[PDB]
Amino acid sequence: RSPGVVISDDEPGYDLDLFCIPNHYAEDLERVFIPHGLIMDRTERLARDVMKEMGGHIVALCVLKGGYKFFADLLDYIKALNRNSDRSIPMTVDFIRLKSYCNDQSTGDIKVIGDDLSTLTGKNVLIVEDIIDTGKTMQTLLSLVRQYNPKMVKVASLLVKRTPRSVGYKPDFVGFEIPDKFVVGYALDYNEYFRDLNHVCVISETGKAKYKA
Amino acid sequence: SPGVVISDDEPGYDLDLFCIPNHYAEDLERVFIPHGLIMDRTERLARDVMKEMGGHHIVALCVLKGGYKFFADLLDYIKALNRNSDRSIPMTVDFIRLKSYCQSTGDIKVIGGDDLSTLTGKNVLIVEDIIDTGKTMQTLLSLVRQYNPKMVKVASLLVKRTPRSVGYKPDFVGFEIPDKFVVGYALDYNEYFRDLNHVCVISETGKAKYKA
Amino acid sequence: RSPGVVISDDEPGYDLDLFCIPNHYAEDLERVFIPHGLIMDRTERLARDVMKEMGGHIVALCVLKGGYKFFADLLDYIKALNRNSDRSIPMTVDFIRLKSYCNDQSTGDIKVIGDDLSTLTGKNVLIVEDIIDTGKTMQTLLSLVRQYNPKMVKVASLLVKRTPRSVGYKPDFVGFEIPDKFVVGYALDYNEYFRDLNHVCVISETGKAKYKA
Amino acid sequence: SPGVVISDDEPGYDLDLFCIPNHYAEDLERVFIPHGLIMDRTERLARDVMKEMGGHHIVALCVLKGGYKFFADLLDYIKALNRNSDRSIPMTVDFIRLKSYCQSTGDIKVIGGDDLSTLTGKNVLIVEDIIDTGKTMQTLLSLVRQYNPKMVKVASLLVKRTPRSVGYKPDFVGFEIPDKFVVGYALDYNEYFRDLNHVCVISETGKAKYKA
Ligand SMILES: O=c1[nH]cnc2c1ncn2CCOCCP(=O)(O)O
Ligand SMILES: O=c1[nH]cnc2c1ncn2CCOCCP(=O)(O)O
Ligand SMILES: O=c1[nH]cnc2c1ncn2CCOCCP(=O)(O)O
Ligand SMILES: O=c1[nH]cnc2c1ncn2CCOCCP(=O)(O)O
């Protein structure tokens, strides 16, 4: 559908010493995958795409705690397009909280939702996500919005991992399709760390162990 | 310190001196605070924040009404400062969502309040975009303090100079401004001015055009 | 004509502890006059104005060694407007070198110019300046360009000091009209220092003495 | 280290993946380096520069052909790093202006060459946007070194991977790129693409449309 910028399994990303990384993360990473400014540029084209489709009207839906960073930037770029409209265009920002927990037994997925979503009826709703792996967060967000009978529904995600997709709702706007590696930085922390890391990088084993839980 | 004081005297800035979207040509009076000025002040606030709360964990709690632009920017500057620390400092970011009612701002209605007990024994920075009568905050302080945090500080982009004020003063003030109704940057008006970068006084023809 | 943003003699600028200033300049300044981002926003409106007038065509003329900073930013904003034109618009950047020396005796002003200005004939030329005080740099740049018979001539200056103007060519685009104080930062260094200072501030006596010559 | 190597293999990026001005829809083949990637790399180069030349004075010498965007950006990052130093480090910024002639790039024609003897006994960083055959630089190095600087390093945004290359290698490389003719960011084409943020390979219909 437009797989986004494809970062392939074959020799992925960039060597660490090529970009600016906080010294206190010198050992906590393997490679860098997507430098910040690269995220920005892509996110910019992405906002252009969104307006192509959406815009009757638009309710941008942010997924809380985690997804604020990418939402912020994506919306900054959109606000940027809107400044030139001949009529001022109302956009409404909306929020769901959503947390996940390790399943442990069974397989069974654990999702804890959101609250107050009256502002959804008959509107054009964009779901904004940080990353897609198993597809459950997306699937969860999907049926949740269909529940409030909107007009239109699209999913934007900065990241889509190249993994065993169960079958679902293929995202409409994809920032980057990346290898099956565990990534931190930009929008993805690891137990409260890496927030000051602007780039999407692969966490190392030293990092995982050091940044406990 | 009451932050950058913008006087009752000569208000702010003439509209044509800065870049504003054509669709708002009519909906404003003055520019109080251009976007970049907000950024520069915010960069400083972030620095003040680390001086008093740095090293320790800190839970950044955003008072989420209609947007979190300010929160977003404050945290980028804070993250920018934390890039230098010898040790990586973990930062917990959370939101407390308020819905609006009633004239009677002191009555808060929290919606997004997951484990409020995560706050217990932690260092909380509460981030707010504008303080007016001061009622919302002071009754929000009451709620928060019951979960006995180790310490609570408050940071507001804008503190309005009003008689209607009950005297609550934030620990970090971006700008002390005149008692006029402002929009822009982080303050929307019935879903409008979201794309306006600057803090500007809303005109009467804008007040009518966009009113709920 | 449009005096620009007026910073008046009466209680000018902001207290130092209100903005972010390099620690190594803690004592070398009195007040801050124009924070960086404020310069940016104004510069932005300024680029809009320029396009109003100019644009047949445009030759933006940069004054070398000193004026590169403001030129860079002003042109970045203009490039930004140009991206939306339906036809790609050629802009030509041009350069003069220009140095001044303390007069000492007489009064007599010393100006050392520039070289190769063939690309001036019949074009629309913008003179870009950092600051206007006595008006001589502007006057010098003026008669120099009139010498190559252009079509149109305008002066943009970020700063205009409120001082004894001798009489000349009043600038077309003014960023800020500021008090008669000695200012450093942003585009104005002091013997190689203050380049890392983004804001326009008033140099103190400690600063003057410390930053020798 | 040869900088960020962009392979002959899979070139760069599909045009529709990034934001490019509508008037160039037709005048390009691929995006090699999006603007923000340039910025991020440049931020690192600035850091590498300070590691080897920091503390000392350093004269930043920009090789000025048609523009100095890159120079401008490199110096902002350098100034950004210098904001932290205990002592203020004075930085001398100068330009050396070259005009173009003749196929024979090694023959330089300096125009803007005020006191070239200011370089004597100083630490010079020479900043260039693209290196191709390497002739311009190596004969520019000859000129500069005669004023006996204490030390000369060279920094180039782009080093082109060409057989036509005489083997000169800069001390700091932004990106090693394929042997294709690129425009954008800092490289204009007969006054065009100045407003193009990214490094992109120029198409043949763009080569014709804008040719001198
Ligand atoms: O690579 C990852 N870094 C950080 N968190 C990750 C990563 N991969 C998966 N996660 C968990 C959070 O996102 C899960 C997306 P879902 O599996 O589609 O619901
Ligand atoms: O000037 C205003 N612009 C936008 N919203 C405003 C303004 N003044 C008051 N409000 C509503 C939200 O501020 C109320 C917080 P409180 O009055 O301190 O409880
Ligand atoms: O306030 C100043 N800071 C730094 N340099 C300054 C200042 N005022 C004057 N100068 C000298 C450089 O500009 C001179 C402009 P002119 O006197 O109009 O030719
Ligand atoms: O790919 C190019 N884009 C724009 N200008 C280019 C390109 N390749 C060569 N030039 C001309 C300037 O570069 C020549 C420097 P030299 O060939 O190392 O002496």
Coordinates of N, CA and C in Angstrom, one line a residue, chain A residues 21-25 28 62 64-73 76 79-80 82-95 97 99 101 114-116 118-119 186 191-193 195-198 211, chain B residues 21-24 27 57 64-69 71-73 75-76 79-80 82-97 99 111-115 185 190-192 194-197 209-210:
Chain A
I21 N 25.5 10.7 19.7 CA 24.8 9.9 20.7 C 25.3 10.3 22.0
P22 N 24.3 10.4 23.0 CA 24.7 10.7 24.4 C 25.8 9.8 24.9
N23 N 26.8 10.3 25.5 CA 27.9 9.5 26.1 C 27.4 8.4 27.0
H24 N 26.4 8.7 27.8 CA 25.9 7.7 28.8 C 25.2 6.5 28.1
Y25 N 25.1 6.5 26.8 CA 24.5 5.4 26.0 C 25.6 4.8 25.1
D28 N 25.1 1.0 25.3 CA 23.8 0.5 25.4 C 23.1 0.3 24.1
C62 N -4.4 10.5 19.9 CA -3.1 10.2 20.5 C -3.3 9.1 21.5
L64 N -2.1 7.4 24.8 CA -1.4 8.1 25.9 C -0.4 7.4 26.8
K65 N 0.3 8.2 27.6 CA 1.6 7.9 28.1 C 2.7 7.8 27.0
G66 N 2.7 6.7 26.2 CA 3.7 6.4 25.3 C 3.8 7.3 24.0
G67 N 2.7 7.4 23.3 CA 2.8 8.0 21.9 C 2.8 9.5 21.8
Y68 N 3.0 10.2 22.8 CA 3.0 11.7 22.8 C 4.0 12.3 21.9
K69 N 5.2 11.7 21.8 CA 6.3 12.3 21.1 C 6.0 12.4 19.6
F70 N 5.8 11.3 19.0 CA 5.5 11.2 17.5 C 4.2 12.0 17.2
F71 N 3.2 11.9 18.1 CA 2.0 12.7 17.9 C 2.3 14.1 17.8
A72 N 3.1 14.6 18.7 CA 3.5 16.0 18.8 C 4.2 16.4 17.5
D73 N 5.1 15.7 17.0 CA 5.9 16.0 15.8 C 5.0 16.0 14.6
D76 N 2.7 18.9 14.6 CA 3.4 20.1 14.3 C 3.6 20.3 12.8
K79 N -0.1 21.1 11.5 CA -0.4 22.5 11.8 C 0.4 23.4 10.8
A80 N 1.6 22.9 10.4 CA 2.4 23.7 9.5 C 1.7 23.8 8.1
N82 N -1.6 23.5 7.6 CA -2.8 24.2 7.8 C -2.7 25.8 7.8
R83 N -1.6 26.3 8.1 CA -1.4 27.7 8.1 C -1.7 28.4 6.8
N84 N -1.7 27.7 5.7 CA -1.9 28.3 4.4 C -3.3 28.1 3.9
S85 N -4.1 27.3 4.6 CA -5.5 27.2 4.1 C -6.2 28.6 4.1
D86 N -7.1 28.7 3.1 CA -7.8 30.0 2.9 C -8.9 30.2 4.0
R87 N -9.4 29.1 4.5 CA -10.3 29.1 5.7 C -9.6 28.4 6.8
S88 N -9.7 28.9 8.1 CA -9.1 28.2 9.2 C -9.8 26.9 9.4
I89 N -9.0 25.8 9.6 CA -9.5 24.5 9.7 C -9.4 23.9 11.1
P90 N -10.6 23.6 11.7 CA -10.6 23.1 13.1 C -10.1 21.7 13.0
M91 N -9.1 21.4 13.9 CA -8.7 20.0 14.1 C -8.9 19.8 15.6
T92 N -9.4 18.6 15.9 CA -9.6 18.2 17.3 C -8.7 17.0 17.7
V93 N -7.8 17.3 18.7 CA -7.0 16.3 19.3 C -7.7 15.5 20.3
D94 N -7.6 14.2 20.3 CA -8.2 13.3 21.3 C -7.3 12.3 21.9
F95 N -7.6 11.7 23.0 CA -6.7 10.9 23.8 C -7.3 9.6 24.3
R97 N -5.7 6.4 26.8 CA -4.6 5.8 27.5 C -4.7 4.3 27.2
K99 N -2.3 0.6 28.1 CA -1.1 -0.1 28.6 C -1.1 -1.6 28.3
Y101 N 0.8 -5.5 29.2 CA 1.5 -6.3 30.1 C 2.0 -7.6 29.5
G114 N -8.5 4.4 28.5 CA -8.9 5.3 27.4 C -9.8 6.4 27.9
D115 N -11.1 6.1 28.0 CA -12.1 7.0 28.7 C -12.5 8.2 27.9
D116 N -13.8 8.6 28.1 CA -14.4 9.8 27.4 C -14.0 9.9 25.9
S118 N -16.5 10.9 23.4 CA -17.7 11.4 22.9 C -17.5 12.1 21.5
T119 N -16.3 12.7 21.4 CA -15.9 13.5 20.3 C -15.5 12.6 19.1
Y186 N 13.9 8.1 20.3 CA 12.8 8.9 19.8 C 11.5 8.8 20.5
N191 N 12.1 1.1 30.0 CA 12.0 1.3 31.4 C 12.4 2.7 31.9
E192 N 11.9 3.7 31.2 CA 12.1 5.1 31.5 C 13.4 5.7 30.9
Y193 N 14.3 4.9 30.3 CA 15.5 5.4 29.7 C 15.4 5.6 28.2
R195 N 14.9 8.3 26.6 CA 14.0 9.4 26.2 C 14.9 10.6 25.6
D196 N 16.1 10.7 26.1 CA 17.0 11.8 25.6 C 17.7 11.3 24.4
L197 N 17.5 10.1 23.9 CA 18.0 9.6 22.7 C 17.0 9.9 21.5
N198 N 17.5 10.7 20.6 CA 16.6 11.2 19.5 C 16.5 10.2 18.3
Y211 N 19.7 -1.3 32.1 CA 18.5 -0.5 32.3 C 17.3 -1.4 32.9
Chain B
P21 N -0.9 33.6 10.1 CA -1.7 33.0 9.1 C -2.7 33.9 8.6
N22 N -2.9 34.0 7.3 CA -3.9 34.9 6.7 C -5.3 34.8 7.2
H23 N -5.7 33.5 7.6 CA -7.1 33.3 8.0 C -7.4 33.9 9.4
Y24 N -6.3 34.4 10.1 CA -6.5 35.0 11.4 C -6.2 36.5 11.4
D27 N -8.8 38.1 13.5 CA -9.3 37.4 14.7 C -8.5 37.7 15.9
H57 N 14.8 11.2 40.2 CA 14.0 10.6 39.1 C 13.1 11.7 38.4
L64 N -3.4 17.9 31.2 CA -3.9 17.8 29.9 C -5.3 18.3 29.7
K65 N -5.5 19.6 29.3 CA -6.8 20.0 28.9 C -7.1 19.7 27.5
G66 N -6.8 20.7 26.6 CA -7.0 20.5 25.2 C -5.8 20.2 24.3
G67 N -4.6 20.5 24.8 CA -3.4 20.2 24.1 C -2.2 20.0 25.1
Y68 N -1.1 19.7 24.6 CA 0.1 19.6 25.4 C 1.4 20.1 24.7
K69 N 1.2 21.0 23.7 CA 2.3 21.6 23.0 C 3.4 22.1 24.0
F71 N 4.0 21.4 27.2 CA 4.6 20.2 27.8 C 5.6 19.6 26.9
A72 N 5.2 19.3 25.6 CA 6.1 18.7 24.6 C 7.4 19.5 24.5
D73 N 7.3 20.8 24.4 CA 8.5 21.6 24.2 C 9.3 21.7 25.5
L75 N 9.6 19.4 27.6 CA 10.3 18.2 27.8 C 11.4 17.9 26.8
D76 N 11.3 18.5 25.6 CA 12.4 18.4 24.6 C 13.6 19.1 25.2
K79 N 15.0 17.0 28.0 CA 15.8 15.9 27.4 C 17.1 16.4 26.8
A80 N 17.1 17.6 26.2 CA 18.3 18.1 25.6 C 19.4 18.4 26.6
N82 N 19.6 16.7 29.5 CA 19.9 15.4 30.1 C 20.8 14.6 29.2
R83 N 20.9 15.0 28.0 CA 21.9 14.4 27.1 C 23.3 14.4 27.6
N84 N 23.6 15.3 28.5 CA 25.0 15.6 28.9 C 25.4 14.8 30.2
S85 N 24.4 14.4 31.0 CA 24.7 13.8 32.3 C 25.5 12.5 32.2
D86 N 26.5 12.4 33.1 CA 27.4 11.2 33.1 C 26.6 10.0 33.2
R87 N 25.6 9.9 34.1 CA 24.7 8.8 34.3 C 23.4 9.1 33.5
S88 N 22.8 8.1 33.0 CA 21.5 8.4 32.3 C 20.5 8.5 33.4
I89 N 19.7 9.6 33.3 CA 18.6 9.9 34.3 C 17.3 9.5 33.7
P90 N 16.6 8.5 34.3 CA 15.3 8.0 33.9 C 14.3 9.1 34.2
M91 N 13.4 9.4 33.2 CA 12.4 10.4 33.4 C 11.0 9.7 33.2
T92 N 10.2 9.8 34.2 CA 8.8 9.3 34.0 C 7.9 10.4 33.6
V93 N 7.3 10.2 32.4 CA 6.3 11.2 31.9 C 4.9 10.7 32.0
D94 N 4.0 11.4 32.6 CA 2.6 11.0 32.6 C 1.7 12.2 32.4
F95 N 0.4 11.9 32.2 CA -0.6 12.9 31.9 C -1.7 12.8 32.9
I96 N -2.3 13.9 33.3 CA -3.6 13.9 34.1 C -4.6 14.8 33.3
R97 N -5.6 14.1 32.8 CA -6.6 14.7 31.8 C -7.7 15.3 32.6
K99 N -11.5 17.5 32.2 CA -12.6 17.8 31.3 C -13.3 19.0 31.9
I111 N -10.2 12.6 34.4 CA -10.6 11.5 33.6 C -9.4 10.5 33.5
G112 N -8.4 11.0 32.9 CA -7.1 10.2 32.7 C -6.3 10.2 33.9
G113 N -6.6 9.2 34.9 CA -5.9 9.1 36.1 C -5.5 7.7 36.5
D114 N -4.8 7.1 35.6 CA -4.2 5.8 35.9 C -3.4 5.9 37.2
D115 N -3.2 4.7 37.9 CA -2.3 4.7 39.1 C -1.8 6.1 39.5
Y185 N -0.1 29.1 20.3 CA 0.9 28.2 20.8 C 0.2 26.9 21.4
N190 N -12.2 26.8 21.0 CA -13.1 25.9 20.4 C -12.5 25.2 19.2
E191 N -11.3 24.5 19.4 CA -10.7 23.8 18.3 C -9.9 24.7 17.3
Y192 N -9.9 26.0 17.5 CA -9.3 26.9 16.5 C -8.0 27.5 17.1
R194 N -5.2 26.4 16.7 CA -4.3 25.3 16.9 C -3.0 25.5 16.1
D195 N -3.2 26.1 14.9 CA -2.1 26.3 14.0 C -1.4 27.7 14.2
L196 N -1.9 28.4 15.2 CA -1.2 29.7 15.5 C -0.1 29.5 16.5
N197 N 1.1 29.9 16.1 CA 2.4 29.7 16.8 C 2.5 30.6 18.0
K209 N -16.6 34.6 15.5 CA -16.4 33.7 14.4 C -16.3 32.2 14.9
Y210 N -15.5 32.1 15.9 CA -15.1 30.7 16.3 C -15.8 30.2 17.6

